[PDB]
Point group: C6
Chain length 206, copies 6
């Protein structure tokens, strides 16, 4: 990454943390924030390093390459560029993705005045592709998350919003009630409209 | 976090510590202090990062969002130049940038948007702890062969979960007879150490 | 904590220290050697830090209530001896319940320093010693050598003695088994411990 | 390594990380990036240290030595050396490979004005040889990766691109090797289907 | 401990150092190789730090009392050999950290010229630890003999491990040959005076 | 050790534990020797002795190492006989020199690298020990009838590495199905070629 504005080597802890997150959690949605936090201050070279250290899930990694190329093409459309000697150049899509730019070029853009934040732009493209992958690898739809006959209400709400988080990559208490089991459904409808989640779960912890 | 005043990337150790305390302890009450310690100096962005790295307990996290919106609404209710004042959603990091948060937290006078957001978050977490307390204090009663120490442990762990923001009278009433008589005979004003020694 | 431009600043408590403390409590309960570890882990701690460390303990809530009791006793005695734009800290200020972090830093870094962190740590360790003594599973009088290596018996004797006092070798000889008791009596009164264990191995 | 420019001792964490990734992953392709990251800023001495701490896989390390000598010979051809009281010398292949150069000489080149990145050049040679080894230890060819009659399309694409990565140390071959249930669907999708689209089709 | 940064400052002892010491005592007890680790873990230690490390040991309380005995003996001899706003002169119990404050220890350790109370206390502690190492040696060098099928190298390992424990206090080859089994003993005897250890081990391999 | 921020620094718990672990887990396999050198980066002689002394086992090896050290110290005294003084063998080995003296030598201008010299002696002795504890001779590494060529080459060069503390013996000791292929390859064949052919 880069820090203070000086480039810093990616740490063995950060590298291992990421590889382990991917090994342990695959593309569950909570992997996306960790990546963003682990890639705090990352140059594009560092981001490519992090992606490449993942050994498995190579289908997902190919899809990710596709999404990155879609964003790079849209970048070339939105901010077309032409260089003068002794002066730096403006980055195009393949430059933000680190395939045609050097480390020094990335550092120059990221620490220039005004700064051109190629690391954040690349990270946004990467998270866009990751969100697509998380949504795709979601095992079941939100319409199919229904409370079982003896399933504790808390566990059902856990499943409901975990699925919603994967599928949103809103505040559907109506589907939540509709998909609750009959006893809980009767109680929740009698609770009234505008009931918060705490109220719904307290009403149904029996 | 903002440290000594420059911004620092959230550390892998902190991230892992938080994820692990949630994985290993769920919402036992001692998880809230750890969050506060792990989020020392956190910007709102950092706090959102820590919350989002939690993979389970999404019911609790929705409840937490609800509480946060209640606190943000009260902030806007009570606290309504080219080159701005923070609203509720700004302190919660949903409508503010990192740079804006740094500006508020690092200023004279400082505007502690990180501490304000953390306070709202801890209010909601305490609520969640209260919800996940399996038994009320009225049901914490000493067993017939249960050591007094173990009963007091359970009693105050439950009391702590139910009071997430003379406790030795209910304690005596709920103690088993063999120990209740001794405690009653100790008299008024006995400390906990004295009560526990008497029933050792 | 408060750590030393070469001057003292406030630092966030580290995940390693927090985890070390939580782990030591999980693994060792209130064995006496938990108190040294705490003192080292709370090196330079503000009262806020000390309360943070205590609050991360999840179990043993009886002991922690007992600890609060001891803290209130020490805070009352502080108020008795030191009655009272920076202000002098009272008992509840040293215990971190009515003082802010900035107030604690100000007291701790004044010239001359008012060591509210060390004083609070002293109260906390006083209460912890009470808990260690109370939770000692055996009295020293019941530690007697079996028909058991002298070294193991002395280990038990002084581990129990350490818990119970939170110290005489006469009891050590009295409670030893006769095989070693004859040797110890013949050794001469005034024998060191090395001489006793070296003698009857 | 050289760090923001000073010399730093190689860290125990980096040494252990490298030894562990080699023990756990052998020469799977994702070992080469890790090496590059663990050797960020490494001098040639540091690179040799990391390589030498590997205890097994001595066939691969001898092959790597062969590749290093091949690159050193090409360096000497295209960047000849001529034979400076107090002044500094031009690096040959074996100096960049750390076999005839001292630590201070490596520091001098890497920290010169203009800098001569002998560490990056040596690292490039090392990664060329490692890629050759990864290719050698690849267990299957891309021609032999075919979808099973009950294999989820996602798992087959995983195997396909993992093998492709080891070999290149595509959608047409991907469809051709798919099972008929999936092949018919993919063919009906029409040309130009993206991977996301294809995988959704055969989900 | 005390460590340079441009001025010698006190730094809090780290959780890593504390854990390393407690774990090595738990895992290795008082085998001779624990004493170097302590010295390394107590690099730059003040007497307070050394006492902290010692006090974190939960077991082996017999050994810790024995250690206390040695420390008091050294402190009394210190008071003999160096009879005792400005800095006071340190006595035995000051170097042992029982009657001196942390600030006093820093003053002595950082005075010009320095009075190294931390190194002196560490020396007393290692002397006592060496006594404990000798006591907890399970067997004497006279009782280490190779069995009829024990590889010579393993036997020499046992022999010198015992020698290291027993000689932890302030000619190795002859007993080594004498206690070897006849099979290797004959070879070594035929080798000649002045055989190196490598030569002996090769001869019996 | 002695590093630049040029002061003495306390040895870190990571280095101590790393060394003890690599010795416990790998004994004197050759790849321990680089690890030691890397773990002792910037070490004073005192530090090197610390690392050696923390090893609890292998006391035969440690005496053998001591033997090699005394031979090197004697050769130093013969080559380089003797305010600031010149270091002798026992000074470089840390038995008669203080820490402050070692720092003076290591940080003088010009530097007297007592740490590098002592490390050289220690690694020389370690190489002898590594060679001795190699279980089999290179002449005895022969390809099995059903043994994959890659595994045989792995063993061959691991043994060669333990014995050096290339083409003809490798082919000669291969099994005949692979030996015939290798012989037909001709001279000058690289290892990569030999291994792809026999896969
Ligand atoms: C004022 O409140 C706020 C405060 C901060 C944030 N900020 C900026 C975040 O970054 C939050 C951090 C956060 C995380 C947990 C609890 C509280 C807060 N991040 C998410 O909340 C991610 N997240 C979003 C997808 N899903 S969902 O199931 O699709 C979903 C379900 C219901 C609804 N109504 C919408 C989405 C849930 C989830 O945990 C957001 C809101
Ligand atoms: C003077 O003594 C003090 C010193 C410091 C504090 N400070 C600031 C804290 O931060 C304390 C830390 C603490 C922890 C253990 C021992 C001592 C101290 N911690 C809480 O104050 C929160 N806390 C308070 C009770 N609860 S309870 O069981 O609900 C409960 C039980 C009985 C009653 N009557 C009411 C509530 C558990 C808990 O986590 C507080 C008191
Ligand atoms: C001898 O010179 C000195 C030097 C330093 C100290 N200082 C300041 C300490 O901090 C010592 C450090 C220490 C620790 C272990 C071994 C040696 C030394 N440690 C304690 O003082 C705590 N401590 C006290 C309770 N018990 S005990 O079993 O009840 C016990 C039973 C009988 C007797 N006579 C004493 C104690 C043992 C213990 O480890 C003290 C004395
Ligand atoms: C899309 O935007 C970019 C951004 C950055 C990169 N950069 C510079 C890399 O470095 C990529 C990082 C990377 C990783 C995942 C997603 C996106 C990016 N990292 C590699 O390792 C490339 N890479 C991946 C294996 N393959 S392949 O499987 O043989 C292979 C597969 C398909 C085809 N058509 C050909 C070969 C070899 C290879 O060169 C590349 C693309
Ligand atoms: C020039 O050579 C030297 C170089 C350096 C040292 N220095 C200062 C040390 O620190 C050495 C370090 C060391 C450790 C292991 C291998 C090599 C080196 N370590 C000890 O000197 C302590 N040490 C001493 C003997 N014992 S022994 O087995 O009792 C023993 C065995 C045989 C005989 N004849 C006597 C005693 C084991 C031990 O750990 C010493 C001598
Ligand atoms: C090729 O260009 C170079 C580049 C760098 C180096 N430098 C300075 C080293 O430090 C090398 C680093 C190194 C290590 C592995 C692969 C590549 C590189 N390290 C060793 O050379 C140690 N080493 C020692 C001999 N043995 S061997 O198996 O006994 C053996 C080897 C060769 C023959 N002909 C016979 C036996 C294995 C080994 O890895 C040397 C050469």
């Amino acid at each position: 990454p880069i820090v203070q504005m000086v480039h810093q080597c990616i740490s063995p802890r950060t590298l291992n943390a990421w590889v382990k997150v991917v090994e342990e959690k695959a593309f569950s949605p909570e992997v996306i924030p960790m990546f963003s936090a682990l890639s705090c201050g990352a140059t594009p070279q560092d981001l490519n390093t992090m992606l490449n250290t993942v050994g498995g899930h190579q289908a997902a990694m190919q899809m990710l390459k596709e999404t990155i190329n879609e964003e790079a093409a849209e970048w070339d459309r939105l901010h077309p560029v032409h260089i003068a000697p002794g002066q730096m150049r403006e980055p195009r899509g393949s430059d933000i993705a680190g395939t045609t730019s050097t480390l020094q070029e990335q550092i120059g853009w990221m620490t220039h005045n005004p700064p051109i934040p190629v690391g954040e732009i690349y990270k946004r493209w990467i998270i866009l592709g990751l969100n697509k992958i998380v949504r795709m690898y979601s095992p079941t739809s939100i319409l199919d998350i229904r409370q079982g006959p003896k399933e504790p209400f808390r566990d059902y709400v856990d499943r409901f919003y975990k699925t919603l988080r994967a599928e949103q990559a809103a505040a559907t208490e109506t589907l939540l009630v509709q998909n609750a089991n009959p006893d809980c459904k009767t109680i929740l409808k009698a609770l009234g409209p505008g009931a918060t989640l705490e109220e719904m779960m307290t009403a149904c912890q029996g």
